[PDB]
Structure formats: C-alpha cells, structure tokens
Design an enzyme around this catalytic site. Structure first.
Site, short mmCIF file in Angstrom:
data_model
loop_
_atom_site.label_atom_id
_atom_site.label_comp_id
_atom_site.label_asym_id
_atom_site.label_seq_id
_atom_site.Cartn_x
_atom_site.Cartn_y
_atom_site.Cartn_z
N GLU A 67 -3.06 0.97 2.50
CA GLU A 67 -3.60 -0.04 1.60
C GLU A 67 -2.57 -1.13 1.27
O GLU A 67 -1.46 -1.14 1.79
CB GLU A 67 -4.04 0.64 0.30
CG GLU A 67 -5.54 0.86 0.14
CD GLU A 67 -6.22 -0.28 -0.59
OE1 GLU A 67 -5.73 -1.44 -0.51
OE2 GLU A 67 -7.25 -0.02 -1.26
N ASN B 77 -5.83 -0.50 -9.10
CA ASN B 77 -6.03 -0.40 -7.66
C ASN B 77 -5.62 -1.64 -6.85
O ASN B 77 -5.01 -1.51 -5.79
CB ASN B 77 -7.50 -0.05 -7.37
CG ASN B 77 -7.73 0.32 -5.92
OD1 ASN B 77 -7.92 -0.55 -5.08
ND2 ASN B 77 -7.71 1.61 -5.62
N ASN C 4 -12.61 -2.62 -7.52
CA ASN C 4 -11.67 -2.46 -6.43
C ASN C 4 -10.97 -3.75 -6.05
O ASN C 4 -9.99 -4.13 -6.68
CB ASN C 4 -12.42 -1.84 -5.24
CG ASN C 4 -11.52 -1.06 -4.33
OD1 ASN C 4 -10.37 -1.43 -4.12
ND2 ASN C 4 -12.04 0.03 -3.77
N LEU D 223 -7.13 -6.15 3.46
CA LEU D 223 -6.73 -7.15 4.44
C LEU D 223 -5.85 -8.20 3.79
O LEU D 223 -5.91 -8.40 2.57
CB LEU D 223 -7.97 -7.78 5.09
CG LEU D 223 -9.05 -8.37 4.18
CD1 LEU D 223 -8.77 -9.84 3.95
CD2 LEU D 223 -10.40 -8.22 4.84
N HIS D 224 -5.05 -8.88 4.59
CA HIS D 224 -4.16 -9.90 4.08
C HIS D 224 -3.75 -10.83 5.22
O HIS D 224 -3.41 -10.37 6.31
CB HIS D 224 -2.91 -9.24 3.49
CG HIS D 224 -2.13 -10.12 2.56
ND1 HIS D 224 -2.45 -10.25 1.23
CD2 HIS D 224 -1.04 -10.88 2.76
CE1 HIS D 224 -1.59 -11.06 0.65
NE2 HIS D 224 -0.72 -11.46 1.56
N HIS E 268 -8.83 3.53 6.91
CA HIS E 268 -8.70 4.96 6.64
C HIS E 268 -9.27 5.95 7.63
O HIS E 268 -9.19 7.16 7.40
CB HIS E 268 -9.22 5.26 5.23
CG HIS E 268 -8.56 4.46 4.17
ND1 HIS E 268 -9.07 4.32 2.90
CD2 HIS E 268 -7.41 3.73 4.19
CE1 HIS E 268 -8.28 3.55 2.18
NE2 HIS E 268 -7.26 3.18 2.94
CA LIG Z 1 -4.83 -9.20 0.40
CA LIG Z 2 -8.40 -1.04 -2.78
#
Ligand SMILES: [Ca+2]
Ligand SMILES: [Ca+2]
Length: 312
Positions: free
Chosen positions: A19, A118, A173, A271-272, A285
């Site tokens: 994550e 989170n 989230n 995501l990034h 996951h």
């Molecule tokens: Ca991100």
């Molecule tokens: Ca998350």
C-alpha cells in the site's frame, strides 16, 4: 463504459498488503507493508524501492511502546523531504528518509482519542486530509469499520491541529483533493470501500468541509470496492476498485466511471503517479506486488511538487 488494457510492468514483489505508493522530493520511491507480522502482532514496515533493481529496503518499522504499526497510506511533505504516513494502529506519523519517525497525535483537537488512519491527501495549502477507518489507536484493542459505521475523517492543519471533520463512515479509505486551476482547494473526495461509494464535500477552508454528497458510484457487488485514488492533470480521478480487477476513471463531475483500466490482477489497492510522467505505480493484494503502467497523461501535481516561494 470503455475499458483500456495498458501494459503492466512489474516493479517489486513480496510486500504483505502492499500500500501507500509515494515519491519524495528527490524522486525516490516508497511503499508500505501494513500486513507484516511478528508472532501474530502488528509489525508493519515502510520501504524504499530501488526502481532500477526492484530491491527493497525497510527504512522504518514503527512501534510505539511495544505496539507495532500498520502503515497504510503516504503523502510527501513540501517544505521538508519527509513522509506523512497514515497508520491503522498509530494514527498519523511523520517519517524521515533516515528511517526515524514521530507519532503526531494520541488525541485530536477535541481531546478525543485518535483513530487509526488509512490514507491521506495534502491540499495545495499544506493541510492534510486523512481517512480513519480503524478505531482508537494503540494501546486500544484493534478494530476497523468494515461492518459498523465508526470511521472518521481528519484534517491535520498547518498550525498543527488534528481536527476531526466528519464521522460515521463504513471504512473511509482513499482520499483526494480537487483544486481550482489557480491552486485553490475546493472539493474533497473520500472513498467508502464496502458501500461502493465515493463521497464529496466542498472545502470552504482549512478543516472546513460542507455539503456531503454521494459523488460517484463504484462498480461491482464483489467484496471490496474503492481503495486508493489520485487525480491526473485534467482532474480525472483514478480509483483502485479492490476486488474488481479494474481501476475506475471518473470525470471531474463524478457519477459513473467514464472509463475502466483492466489490471492483470484482481485486487488493486493504491496508486500514485511518478512526478512529471504518465507512469502510475499500483500496489495490489492478489500477489502483494507493485506494478506500473502508462496512463493517458501526467498526474496532477502533488503538494510536494509545488513551490512555497514560487512567483507563479
Ligand atoms: Ca497516491
Ligand atoms: Ca487504502
């Protein structure tokens, strides 16, 4: 709804509950492994990934008084190359590149015990919007709002206040901030995983949100839903739909996805974008790995890419 199938390239593997993908001010890449355990107890890790080799390095394994953390989401600071990490057990942490860290809050601005976080998102004003799907931070027994509506939203302001801006979410989230073209923060998007909804608010000022609305709808009846999210340069919101095998693409006005991106895996988590590129790094996951693929355009500049002393 059109679906694209871009090539997904492997980045790194074997990262339990991969994550919080994030890039710092020097272009270094980081990932968090919230599901790493030591004898059944939390022992989450924050790792630096060598993009050339895919080799992993654990720079931090946060623990406060024997209570290990479950680091889950990241954002890079602007005025200092440090990471703000949402931890499901420890709340909000500030992590340095040398691996040291500090626990930001045991209680909020109201003296109320802090909740496990989170994910988070910095707005252009430097304010940090955080989702808190877990119950009270350690030492309290670990609990999470997957079934009951006790998830909260916080805003860690420039003047250091941890303000709870909303509550009663069933596992808040992913979170993102929409800005006007002149850089003014005006809309907050919050993912509520199990309910398959994306919520919006009008940001009126630091820690001030109004007019809560069901902004977008996440496809599928599968277990999961919207996890991590991020905006591209045109303000389209890409959301990881955990359990659907797709990353949903929303237009500026939300509603139903205007496009879906098929992943060669079922559980896309977060995501990034890589600064200055179309590359989107994705954590998942199913295999607990990190991938990357090319999006149709560059990502929206993160707060860390903006200039404090810039004229324009
Ligand atoms: Ca991100
Ligand atoms: Ca998350």
């Amino acid at each position: 709804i059109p679906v694209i199938e871009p090539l997904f390239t492997k980045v790194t593997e074997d990262i339990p509950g991969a994550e919080g993908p994030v890039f710092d001010k020097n272009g270094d890449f980081y990932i968090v492994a919230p599901q790493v355990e030591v004898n059944g107890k939390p022992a989450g890790e924050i790792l630096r990934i060598d993009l050339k080799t895919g080799k992993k390095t654990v720079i931090c394994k946060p623990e406060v008084n024997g209570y290990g953390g479950i680091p889950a989401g990241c954002q890079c600071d602007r005025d200092a190359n440090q990471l703000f990490v949402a931890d499901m057990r420890l709340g909000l942490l500030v992590v340095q590149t040398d691996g040291t860290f500090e626990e930001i809050a045991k209680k909020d601005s109201e003296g109320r015990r802090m909740q496990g976080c989170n994910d988070c998102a910095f707005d252009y004003e430097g304010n940090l919007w955080i989702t808190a799907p877990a119950g009270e931070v350690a030492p309290a027994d670990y609990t999470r709002s997957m079934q009951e509506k006790f998830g909260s939203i916080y805003c860690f302001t420039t003047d250091g206040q941890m303000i709870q801006v909303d509550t009663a979410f069933q596992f808040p989230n992913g979170i993102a901030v929409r800005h006007m073209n002149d850089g003014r923060p005006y809309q907050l998007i919050v993912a509520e995983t199990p309910t398959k909804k994306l919520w919006s608010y009008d940001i009126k000022g630091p820690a001030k949100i109004e007019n809560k609305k069901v902004w977008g709808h996440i496809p599928g009846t599968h277990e999961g839903g919207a996890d991590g999210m991020d905006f591209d340069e045109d303000n389209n919101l890409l959301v990881a739909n955990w359990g659907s095998s797709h990353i949903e693409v929303f237009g500026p006005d939300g509603g139903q996805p205007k496009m879906r991106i098929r992943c060669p895996f079922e559980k896309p988590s977060n995501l990034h974008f890589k600064p200055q590129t179309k590359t989107i790094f994705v954590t998942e996951h199913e295999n607990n790995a990190v991938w990357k693929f090319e999006w149709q355009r560059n990502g929206k500049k993160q707060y860390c890419e903006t200039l404090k002393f810039g004229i324009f």
